[PDB]
Amino acid sequence: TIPGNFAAYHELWRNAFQEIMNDPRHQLHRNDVEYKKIHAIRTVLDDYTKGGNTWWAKFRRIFTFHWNRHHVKVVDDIVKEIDAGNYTTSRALVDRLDNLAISLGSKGTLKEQIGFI
């Protein structure tokens, strides 16, 4: 309930993100063009990096956690990746989001959970 490492925070975040993307108010269909999906995801991620006042109010709790600051910085980098044109499918975008907490070395999926993918 209080995430004790960055991966645990990301797991809470994934659950929230999935709920938000499945919100009926997006009016997203799985046969929509990919640009429409990617843009809706980008809007939600952007709102997340700006304090979550539009889409993340229900999950206001996560913004107080220690891990939020760094996680917001990583999501901000991904929004930049969207803006740079790195994603042509929403599937690839949510895979990036899925796996953002893992790293190489040492010191189901989001696709399946989201209806329009």
Numbering used by the authors: 251 to 357, 362 to 371
Report text from the authors:
To define the mechanism of LegL1 inhibition of RavJ, we first solved the crystal structure of the N‐ and C‐terminal portions of RavJ spanning amino acid residues 1–228 and 251–371, respectively. Structures for amino acid residues 1–228 and 251–371 of RavJ were solved separately to a resolution of 1.3 and 1.9 Å, respectively. The C‐terminal domain of RavJ did not reveal any structural similarity to known proteins or functional domains, but we identified a short conserved motif (H316‐WNRHH‐V322) that is present in another IDTS, WipB, as well as several non‐Legionella proteins. A conserved motif (highlighted in gray) is located in the C‐terminal domain with surface exposed residues H316, R319, and H320. While expression of full‐length RavJ showed a severe growth defect in a spot dilution assay, mutation of each of the putative catalytic residues or the adjacent W172 to alanine fully relieved toxicity as did substitutions in the conserved C‐terminal motif. Septins and elongator complex proteins were identified only with full‐length RavJ and the (230–391) C‐terminal domain, suggesting that the C‐terminal domain is a substrate‐binding domain. Use of the otherwise full‐length loop mutant (H316A/R319A/H320A) as bait abrogated these interactions.
